[PDB]
Amino acid sequence: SVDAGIGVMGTKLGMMSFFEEDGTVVPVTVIGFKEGNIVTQVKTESTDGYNAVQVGYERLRDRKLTMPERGHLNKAGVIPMRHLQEFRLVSVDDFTPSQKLLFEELFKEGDMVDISGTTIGKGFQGGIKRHNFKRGLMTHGSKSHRALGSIGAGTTPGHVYKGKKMPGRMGGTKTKIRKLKIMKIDTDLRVVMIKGAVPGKPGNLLRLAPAKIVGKNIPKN
């Protein structure tokens, strides 16, 4: 999964409504930023086997970081950071450890992004809610209701299948929302407004990459 261009990380601040001159209201997620988006490490095909660049994000007090990690950011000559991530490119010549990224130079207006984040955890969920199972009959005689139904066939095969859909834990995962649009960038507040929803509640951690379009940005295979 080679990624087109460098992305940055940001924090979801929550959604508001945003007018256009002709009175079109677009709901937008407001993505704020914090001190960070600093290139931490760079990995060459020779040395690491592939091409990638590791950016750090959130600043942090020194104590809170562990000795191995602190040593990792001292080798870079960068400030202490909470989250590290990797972007995977096809060409890494433009990047030097300790370099800084500015989201104003990587993202214009009317551009397409891709937002990865973690989803809201809904806990341990039933068949209905997790898979959209239809619920059985509520009244005439029936004792089923929200129950799972039958889980397999008879004597043959005589065991349930793998992957057969069941109640378990729902949400709380890396999710990617493809092809969003950037409505407005505010320099004063250093914020980006994006049309539509992105995963997770305010105070989340997001990853924005320029959109991967399977024909034209990526290796053919």
Partner: protein, 121 residues
Amino acid sequence: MIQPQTHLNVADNSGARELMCIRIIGASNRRYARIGDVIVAVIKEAIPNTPLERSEVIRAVVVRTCKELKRDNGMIIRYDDNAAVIIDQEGNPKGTRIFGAIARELRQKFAKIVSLAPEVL
């Protein structure tokens, strides 16, 4: 949000007092008629001695819902009843005069209907 077995009031001359919706059309497998959708209805109550007999199967377009229509202005519109207007398969209303308000959202597919209206919203 008209769906089968829903009862409707008719908005025009056409001489039907009440319609029961049996089908939504052109929406593929949708279950919801909303404003501007063509539904197959049947006539339940008729205005006596009119070209329309009860128990007729007819086409009509939904011009009013109790559900809410959302324009791009952020504007929303909600009526107090459901109503449709009985048409031909050409888009021409069978009855020649229409009651009640309508929306500018019908202007694309039905001209006649927006024309005959007493008010436009």
